[PDB]
Subunit: 258 residues, 3 copies
C-alpha cells in the first residue's frame, strides 16, 4: 500500500507508516491534533481501526475533518467521533472520557525542530517547566502526564524529529511510565532555510549543573544517513554554503505501559 | 449558602481560601489540612462546611496545641470532630500523617509560595509568641526551600505545592486536593501544575486582592524577561491589575513601573482556589 | 567481613543487611562482579537474586564468581544477560516486575574518583581467578551513559541516574521496595526528597562517615552553595561535610574547600548512607 501514504510531507509520511506498523486493527484510537482528518481517514481505511476519536486545539477543524473523512473513507466514516471544541491536548471532560476508553493514543505534536512550514494558518509557556522541554519536547511530555493518568493501560504513539538522539527520545517515555519502541524511522531533508541554532546551542552549553558534558545531535549529510554530523557541523556547510543539503531522522515511537 | 459573615474580610488570601473551601463541598467529608496554623480554617470547615472529620498538621509543633483551643472556642458543638496529628510535620512526611491523609477524602492547604504577602512570616511569628502564651516562656521553622528547588514548578515559585501533589498522589490517590494560589503566573501554569502531577484542575473560586504596598514583585518581573534558549523565546506576561474589579490589566513590568513613578500606586492580583480531582 | 579499602560498599552491604531481605526476591542494578549478590545470598539470606549490568560481560563473570563465593546457595542467582542500562530490557523488566526489592549502588556525582579504576581491576582479578588469562576487555568503554539523564530534576544535585531508576521501578514494580546507596554531601533532606518526589517514603537504613580521598574535586558542591534557586532568588544551601571521622565537627563545602587550600591535604569526610524507598501499600 505504498500508494496510501504520500511523500509530499515526509513528517506526515513517517507518521502514517508507523501508524500502520503500530497495529491499529480493531482498536479504539484517540488522535490528539486531528487537524484536517487525513490521519483519521488513514487510520480508518488502511489500519482498520474499530473506532477513531480525537480533538484539536482549533475548534473548527474538528468539523472539517468530518467531511474529509466522509469523503476519503465513506464506508467507515461512521466510526469517527471527534470531540468538538477547542481542546488543548486532552483537557476537557469529553476528551478525557474518550481518551479514557481508547487502547491507543496517537499524535504528532508541536516540538522544537518541526518544519516551520507548519502554521500555515488557514500552547507554549505552561509547558516550559517540563524537564524534557530542555530538548524541545515539553508539549510531548505534557501529553504523557495526562495519558498515564487518564488511560493508564493505553499505548501512546508519537512522532518525533530525532535530531536530539534516540536515547533521549526513549528517556522521554521511560521518565513517564512507558517503555518505548521505535516503530518506524526515516531520513528526511529539511528545507534549506531552516534554523538549527537550538541544536547547536544544545551541544555547547553545559550540564544541569556546571558539570562537564559531551553531546551531539544526530544529523546526516546524505539522504541515506550514511555520513553523520553534529549540530555544529551541519551548520558549517550552511555557513560556507547556502543550499547545502542537511538531513535528520524522523521517527515514530510507541510507549507501552507496564 | 453560607451567610456573608463567616468569611474573613480582614485578610483576602484567607477569605479566598474559605470561600473556595465552602464551594468545594466538604459536607460529610473527611478533611486533612496541611498547615492548620491557628485552626481558624479548621473551625470554618467544621462549623460552616459541615465536615464530618477534620485532621491535619503543621511544621511548628506548638500550633496544633493552640489550634484545638481555638476550635473549641469557635466551634464548641463540633470540636470533637477535629483530630490533628501532633508533632512537627513537614507537608505530610510522618507516619501518622500519612495514615491520616490516606483516610481523607479531601486534602486542603494554603502553602508557602513565591508571591505571598511579604508580611506572612512575620504574622506567623507574632502569633507564635502570643497565643503560645500558655507556653510558660518557651526545626527549620519554615519550610526550607532548598529541598524543593528541584521541582519543575519551582521555576514559577510553586515547588512546595508540587512536592505536596507528589505526596498526595502516592498516599491518597482517590483524594481531592484543594489549594490556594496567588495567580500572578496565570491560570495556564496553575492548571499545568496539576495536570503534570495526575490531577484534573478546576478553579473553585477567585478574588482580586490588593497587594500591600511596598511588596517585592521582582521575581515576577524576572519571569517576563523570559530567558531565551533552550529554548527559546516566549512571551510571558504576568497577570496584574490596576483596579480592584480587575478591569485594567498590567504586567509585572507595567506594574513595576506604576510603582516606580508613583510609589503607593495600587496594584492588584488574583488569588484563586483550585481543586485537583484525580482522574480516578 | 567487609573491605576497609571500600567504604561505600561496606556501608552499602551493611545497609542490605538491615533491609531484611531474608525470604525476598531481589533485583540488583549493576551486579558488577557479583560480590553484593553473594553477600545478599549468604549474609542476608535472600530467597533468590537477580540483576544486570551495563557491561554485558560482567553477568557471565559474575555467575562464576558467586559460585565460588556462595557455593551453597548460588543456585538462587539468576542473572540477566545483555548490556542492560538500568532495567531497560524486556527480560530485566520481567525480573524486576516480580521482585520484592530492587537494590543498587549507582553512579552519581561525588562517587569516589577511582571507582571506575577499582571496577576494572576487580573485573581483571576475577577473570583470572576463572581462567583467564586475557587482555583489557575488562573494560567499560561506556560513555555512554549520562546525557539522557540530564533533564531529571534531581540531576541538579547529581542524582539524575538515581531518579531515572526510580521512575522505572515505580512503573514496573509499584509494590517493590527500592534500596539505594548515596553520598549525602547534598544533605539527607534532598535525598529524602528524591524518593518523596517519585512516590516513595524514604528511610535511612545505615550511614557511615567516610574519608574523601584527597585530590577530590568538590567545586560542584561549592557551586551548589552559591548559585541561586530556580526562582532564581537567594538560597540557603549548605552541603554536609565533616572534619573528623565521627561526624562530630560539621562543615560546609565552601569551608571544606578552604581547608584544602590551606592544607592541600586535610582529611575531609562526608556521609554515605543506604536509603530504602517504600511505596504506599
Ligand atoms: N496543544 C495542542 N493540543 C492539541 N492539538 C494541538 C496542539 N497544538 C497544536 N495542535 C494541532 O496539532 C496539529 C499538528 S501540529 C504538529 C505538526 C508536526 N510537527 C508535523 O510535522 O506533522 C495541528 O492541526 C494543530 O492544530
Ligand atoms: N547505567 C547503568 N545501568 C546499569 N548498571 C550500571 C550503569 N552504570 C554503571 N553501572 C554499573 O555500576 C557498577 C559500578 S558504579 C559503582 C559506584 C558507586 N557509587 C560506589 O562508589 O560504590 C558497575 O557494575 C557498572 O557497570
Ligand atoms: C560511572 S559513570 C560516572 C559519571 C558521573 N555521572 C559523574 O559525572 O560523576
Amino acid at each position: 500500500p505504498e500508494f496510501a501514504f504520500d511523500p509530499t510531507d515526509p513528517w506526515t509520511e513517517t507518521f502514517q507508516r508507523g501508524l500502520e506498523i503500530a497495529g491499529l486493527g480493531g482498536k479504539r484510537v484517540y488522535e490528539v491534533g486531528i487537524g484536517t482528518g487525513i490521519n483519521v481517514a488513514f487510520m480508518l481505511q488502511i489500519c482498520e481501526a474499530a473506532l477513531v476519536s480525537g480533538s484539536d486545539l482549533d475548534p473548527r477543524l474538528a468539523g472539517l475533518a468530518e467531511r474529509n473523512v466522509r469523503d476519503l473513507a465513506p464506508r467507515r466514516a461512521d466510526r469517527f467521533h471527534p470531540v468538538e471544541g477547542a481542546v488543548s491536548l486532552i483537557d476537557t471532560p469529553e476528551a478525557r472520557a474518550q481518551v479514557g476508553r481508547s487502547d491507543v493514543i496517537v499524535g504528532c505534536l508541536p516540538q522544537v525542530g518541526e518544519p516551520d512550514d507548519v502554521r500555515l494558518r488557514a500552547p507554549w509557556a505552561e509547558f516550559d517547566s517540563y524537564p524534557f522541554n530542555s530538548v524541545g519536547l515539553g508539549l510531548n511530555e505534557a501529553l504523557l502526564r495526562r495519558t498515564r493518568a487518564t488511560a493508564p493501560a493505553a499505548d501512546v504513539v508519537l512522532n518525533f524529529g530525532a535530531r536530539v538522539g534516540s536515547a533521549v527520545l526513549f528517556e522521554l517515555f521511560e521518565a513517564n511510565g512507558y517503555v518505548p519502541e521505535k516503530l518506524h524511522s526515516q531520513i528526511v531533508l529539511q528545507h534549506a532555510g531552516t534554523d538549527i541554532s537550538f541544536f547547536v546551542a544544545l551541544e555547547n552549553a553545559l550540564a544541569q549543573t556546571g558539570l562537564e558534558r559531551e553531546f551531539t545531535c544526530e544529523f546526516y549529510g546524505d539522504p541515506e544517513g550514511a555520513t553523520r554530523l553534529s549540530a555544529t557541523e551541519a551548520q558549517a556547510l550552511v555557513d560556507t554554503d547556502s543550499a547545502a543539503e542537511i538531513y535528520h531522522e524522523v521517527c515514530v515511537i510507541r510507549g507501552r505501559p507496564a
